[PDB]
Coordinates of C-alpha atoms and ligand atoms in Angstrom, one line a residue:
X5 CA 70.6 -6.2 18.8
X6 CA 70.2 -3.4 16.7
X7 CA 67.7 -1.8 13.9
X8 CA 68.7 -3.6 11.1
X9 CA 66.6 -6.2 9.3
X10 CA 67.7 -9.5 11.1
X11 CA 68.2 -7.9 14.2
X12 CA 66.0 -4.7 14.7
X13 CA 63.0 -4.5 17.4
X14 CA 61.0 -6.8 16.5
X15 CA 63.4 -9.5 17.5
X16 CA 64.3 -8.5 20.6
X17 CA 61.9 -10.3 22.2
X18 CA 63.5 -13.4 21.6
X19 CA 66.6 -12.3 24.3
X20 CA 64.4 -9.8 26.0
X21 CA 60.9 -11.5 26.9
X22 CA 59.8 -8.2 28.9
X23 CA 59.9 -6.6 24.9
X24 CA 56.1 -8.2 25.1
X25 CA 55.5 -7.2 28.1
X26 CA 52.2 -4.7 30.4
X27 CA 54.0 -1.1 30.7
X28 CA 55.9 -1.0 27.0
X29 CA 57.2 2.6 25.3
X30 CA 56.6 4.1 22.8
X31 CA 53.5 4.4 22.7
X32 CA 50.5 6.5 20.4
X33 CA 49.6 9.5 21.9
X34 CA 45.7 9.6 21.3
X35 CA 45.0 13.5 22.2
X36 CA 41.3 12.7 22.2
X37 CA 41.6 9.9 24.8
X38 CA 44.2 11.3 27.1
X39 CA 42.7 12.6 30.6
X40 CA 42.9 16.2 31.7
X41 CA 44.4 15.7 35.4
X42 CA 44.2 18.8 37.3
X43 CA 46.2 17.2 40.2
X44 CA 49.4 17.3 38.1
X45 CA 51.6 19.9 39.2
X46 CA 54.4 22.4 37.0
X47 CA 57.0 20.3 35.9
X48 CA 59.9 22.0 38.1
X49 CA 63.6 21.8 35.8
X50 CA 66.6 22.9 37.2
X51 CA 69.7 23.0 34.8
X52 CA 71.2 25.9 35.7
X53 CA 74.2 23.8 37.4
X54 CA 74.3 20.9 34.9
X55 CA 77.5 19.5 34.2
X56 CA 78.1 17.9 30.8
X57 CA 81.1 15.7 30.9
X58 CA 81.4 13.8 27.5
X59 CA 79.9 12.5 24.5
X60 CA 79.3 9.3 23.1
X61 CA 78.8 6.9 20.2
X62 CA 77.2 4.0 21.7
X63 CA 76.6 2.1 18.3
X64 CA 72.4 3.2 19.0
X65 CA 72.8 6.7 19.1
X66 CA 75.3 9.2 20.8
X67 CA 75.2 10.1 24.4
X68 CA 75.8 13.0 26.3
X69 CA 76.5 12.0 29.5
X70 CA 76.5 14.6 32.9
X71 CA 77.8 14.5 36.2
X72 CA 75.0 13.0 38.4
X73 CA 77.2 12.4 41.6
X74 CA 74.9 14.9 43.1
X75 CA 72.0 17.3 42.8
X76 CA 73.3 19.5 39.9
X77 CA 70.5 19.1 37.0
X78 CA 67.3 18.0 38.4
X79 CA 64.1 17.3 37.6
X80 CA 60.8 17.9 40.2
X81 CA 57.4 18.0 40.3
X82 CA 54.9 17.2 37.3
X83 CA 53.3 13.5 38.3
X84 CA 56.8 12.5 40.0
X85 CA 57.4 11.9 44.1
X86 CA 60.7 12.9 45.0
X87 CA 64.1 14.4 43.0
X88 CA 65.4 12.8 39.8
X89 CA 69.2 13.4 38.7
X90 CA 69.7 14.1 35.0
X91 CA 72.4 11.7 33.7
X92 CA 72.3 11.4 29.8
X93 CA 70.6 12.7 26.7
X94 CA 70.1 11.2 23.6
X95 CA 68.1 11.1 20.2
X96 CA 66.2 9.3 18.1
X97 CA 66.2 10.2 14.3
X98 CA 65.2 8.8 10.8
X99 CA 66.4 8.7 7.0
X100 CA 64.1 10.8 6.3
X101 CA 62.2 13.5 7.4
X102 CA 59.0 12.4 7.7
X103 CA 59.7 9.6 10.3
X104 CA 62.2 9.2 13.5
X105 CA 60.3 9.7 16.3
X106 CA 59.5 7.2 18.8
X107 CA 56.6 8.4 20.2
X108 CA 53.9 9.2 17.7
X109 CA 50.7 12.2 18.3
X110 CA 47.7 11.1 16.7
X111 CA 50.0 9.0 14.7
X112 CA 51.9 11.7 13.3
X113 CA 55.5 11.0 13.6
X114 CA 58.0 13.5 14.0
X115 CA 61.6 13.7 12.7
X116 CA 63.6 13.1 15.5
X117 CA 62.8 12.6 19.8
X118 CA 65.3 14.2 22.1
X119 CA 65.2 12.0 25.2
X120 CA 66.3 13.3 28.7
X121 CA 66.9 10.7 30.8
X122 CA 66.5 11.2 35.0
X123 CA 66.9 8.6 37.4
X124 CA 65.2 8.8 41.2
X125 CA 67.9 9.6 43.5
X126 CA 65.9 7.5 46.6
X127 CA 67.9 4.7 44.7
X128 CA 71.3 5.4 45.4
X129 CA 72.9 5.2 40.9
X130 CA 71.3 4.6 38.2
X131 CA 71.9 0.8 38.3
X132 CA 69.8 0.1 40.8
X133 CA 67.2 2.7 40.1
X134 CA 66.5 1.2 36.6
X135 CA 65.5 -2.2 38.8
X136 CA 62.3 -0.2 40.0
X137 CA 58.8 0.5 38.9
X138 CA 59.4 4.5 39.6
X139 CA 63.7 4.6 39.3
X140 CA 63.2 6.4 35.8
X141 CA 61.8 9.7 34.7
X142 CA 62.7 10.4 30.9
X143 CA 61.5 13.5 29.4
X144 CA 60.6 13.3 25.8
X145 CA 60.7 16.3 23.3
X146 CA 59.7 16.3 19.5
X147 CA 61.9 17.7 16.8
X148 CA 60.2 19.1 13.8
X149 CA 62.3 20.3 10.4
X150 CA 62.1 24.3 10.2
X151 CA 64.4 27.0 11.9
X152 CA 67.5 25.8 12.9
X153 CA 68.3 25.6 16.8
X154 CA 70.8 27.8 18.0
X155 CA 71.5 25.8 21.3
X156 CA 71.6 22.2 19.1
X157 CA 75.0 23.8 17.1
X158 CA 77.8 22.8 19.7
X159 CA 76.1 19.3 19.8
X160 CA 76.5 19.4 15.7
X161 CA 79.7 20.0 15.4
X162 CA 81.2 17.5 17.6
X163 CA 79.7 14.6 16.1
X164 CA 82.3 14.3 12.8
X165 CA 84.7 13.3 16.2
X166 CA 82.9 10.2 17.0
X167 CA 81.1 8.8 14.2
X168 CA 81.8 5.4 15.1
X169 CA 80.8 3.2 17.7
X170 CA 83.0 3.4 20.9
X171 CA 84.3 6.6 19.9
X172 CA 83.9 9.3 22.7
X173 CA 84.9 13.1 23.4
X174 CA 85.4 15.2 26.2
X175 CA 81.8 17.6 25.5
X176 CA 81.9 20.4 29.0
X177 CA 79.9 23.3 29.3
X178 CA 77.2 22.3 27.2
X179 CA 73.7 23.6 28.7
X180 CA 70.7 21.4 27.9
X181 CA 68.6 24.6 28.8
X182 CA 69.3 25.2 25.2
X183 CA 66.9 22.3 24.2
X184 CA 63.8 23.1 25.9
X185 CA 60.7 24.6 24.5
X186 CA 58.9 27.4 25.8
X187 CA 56.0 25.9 27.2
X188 CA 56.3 22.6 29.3
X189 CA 52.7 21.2 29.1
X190 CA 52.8 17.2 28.7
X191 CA 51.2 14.7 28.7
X192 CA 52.8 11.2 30.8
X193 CA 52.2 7.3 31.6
X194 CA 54.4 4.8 33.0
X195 CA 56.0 3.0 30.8
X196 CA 59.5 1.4 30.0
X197 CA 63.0 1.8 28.0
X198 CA 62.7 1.7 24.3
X199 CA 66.5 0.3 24.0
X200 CA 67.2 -3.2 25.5
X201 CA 67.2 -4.2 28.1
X202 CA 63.7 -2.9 28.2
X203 CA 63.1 -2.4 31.6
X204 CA 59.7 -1.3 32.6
X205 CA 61.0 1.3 35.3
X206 CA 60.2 4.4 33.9
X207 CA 57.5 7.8 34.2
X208 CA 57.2 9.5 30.3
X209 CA 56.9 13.0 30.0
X210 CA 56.1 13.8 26.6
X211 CA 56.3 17.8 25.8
X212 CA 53.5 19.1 23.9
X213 CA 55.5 21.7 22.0
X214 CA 57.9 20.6 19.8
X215 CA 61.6 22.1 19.2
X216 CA 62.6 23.2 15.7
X217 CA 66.2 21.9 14.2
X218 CA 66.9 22.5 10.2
X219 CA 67.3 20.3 7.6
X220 CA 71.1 20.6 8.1
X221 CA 71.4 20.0 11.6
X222 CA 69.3 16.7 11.3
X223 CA 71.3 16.1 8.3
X224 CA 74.3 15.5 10.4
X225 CA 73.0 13.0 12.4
X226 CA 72.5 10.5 9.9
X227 CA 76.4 10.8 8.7
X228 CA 77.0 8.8 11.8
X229 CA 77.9 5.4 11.9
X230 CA 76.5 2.0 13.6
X231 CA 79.1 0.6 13.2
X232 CA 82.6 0.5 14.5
X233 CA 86.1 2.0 12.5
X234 CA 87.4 -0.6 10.1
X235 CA 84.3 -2.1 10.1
X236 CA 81.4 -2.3 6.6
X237 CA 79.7 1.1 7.1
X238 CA 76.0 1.9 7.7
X239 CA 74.7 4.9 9.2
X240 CA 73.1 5.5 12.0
X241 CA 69.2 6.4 11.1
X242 CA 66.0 4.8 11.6
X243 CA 67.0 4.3 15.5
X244 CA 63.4 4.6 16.8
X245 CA 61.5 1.5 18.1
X246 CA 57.6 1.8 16.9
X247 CA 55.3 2.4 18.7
X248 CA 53.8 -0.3 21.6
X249 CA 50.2 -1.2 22.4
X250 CA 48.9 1.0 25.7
X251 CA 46.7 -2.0 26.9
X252 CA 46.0 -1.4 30.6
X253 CA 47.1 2.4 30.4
X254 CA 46.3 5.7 30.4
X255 CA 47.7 8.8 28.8
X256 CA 47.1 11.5 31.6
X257 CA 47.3 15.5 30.2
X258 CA 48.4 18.8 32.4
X259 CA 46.6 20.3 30.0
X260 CA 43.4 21.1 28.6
Ligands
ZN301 ZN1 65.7 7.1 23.9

């Protein structure tokens, strides 16, 4: 499974049913449809003690992963009961500029998604949280091509040490702070993974404001491989699953 012609998304129905299934991400974000909820709170982020442990190739993108073994990055209040533990970040990018986004606004696509992925710490890891309808919160931010992103560099510059798949390196002190936009307006829906095994456990928050990267930074993203050393190489772009019908949904806005 993978994004290639024989084997990209749409034929991972065929070993993951659930691919066709009620509560499917991405999605289109219709900004004229989605419903002003004044009962959604602040989103509440707390980084400040985030732990970054290592980083990744995991032959669908790169990983870094954080020490969730207890309460050090979290993520509170906007539509979610209860405290999610941050435990990975990851993105999704194109060959070009004009495409890589998952999510879509009005059907404009963006050219990358950073995805922060939480899971509900009710649930004991992240293995078992991913088995229920509220175990995930991912947060979801839009990369546009401009000014380059000063906090983004670090991520960069590692990545020429694992640009194939398997190939991991120790990545500590790295503060996703760096990442975030100024304002945290959103809109969210339930909805699921957009990487096999497409589980339908997770709450979307999708930032209004986009980050800025520049054309170099997402340049360097799409010198990394799919696959493994001593194996044919094709890089790693177009990782983005299109976008799913919303069917019995709605896209609910803490802003107006
Ligand atoms: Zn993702």
């Amino acid at each position: 499974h993978g994004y290639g012609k024989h084997n990209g998304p749409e034929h991972w129905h065929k070993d993951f049913p659930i691919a066709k299934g009620e509560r499917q991400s991405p999605v289109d974000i219709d900004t004229h449809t989605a419903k002003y909820d004044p009962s959604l709170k602040p989103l509440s982020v707390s980084y400040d003690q985030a732990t970054s442990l290592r980083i990744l190739n995991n032959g669908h993108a790169f990983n870094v992963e954080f020490d969730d073994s207890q309460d050090k990055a979290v993520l509170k209040g906007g539509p979610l009961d209860g405290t999610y533990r941050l435990i990975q970040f990851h993105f999704h990018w194109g060959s070009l500029d004009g495409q890589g986004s998952e999510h879509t606004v009005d059907k404009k696509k963006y050219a990358a998604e950073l995805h922060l992925v939480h899971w509900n710490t009710k649930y004991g890891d992240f293995g078992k949280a991913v088995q229920q309808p509220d175990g995930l919160a991912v947060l979801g931010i839009f990369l546009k091509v401009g000014s380059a992103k000063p906090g983004l560099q670090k991520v960069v510059d590692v990545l020429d040490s694992i640009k194939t798949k398997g190939k991991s390196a120790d990545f500590t002190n790295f503060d996703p702070r760096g990442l975030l936009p100024e304002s945290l307006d959103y809109w969210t829906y339930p909805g699921s993974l957009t990487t096999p095994p497409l589980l339908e456990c997770v709450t979307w928050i999708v930032l209004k404001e986009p980050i800025s990267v520049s054309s170099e930074q997402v340049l360097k993203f799409r010198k990394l491989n799919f696959n493994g050393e001593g194996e044919p190489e094709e890089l790693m772009v177009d990782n983005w699953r299109p976008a799913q019908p919303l069917k019995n949904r709605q896209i609910k806005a803490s802003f107006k």
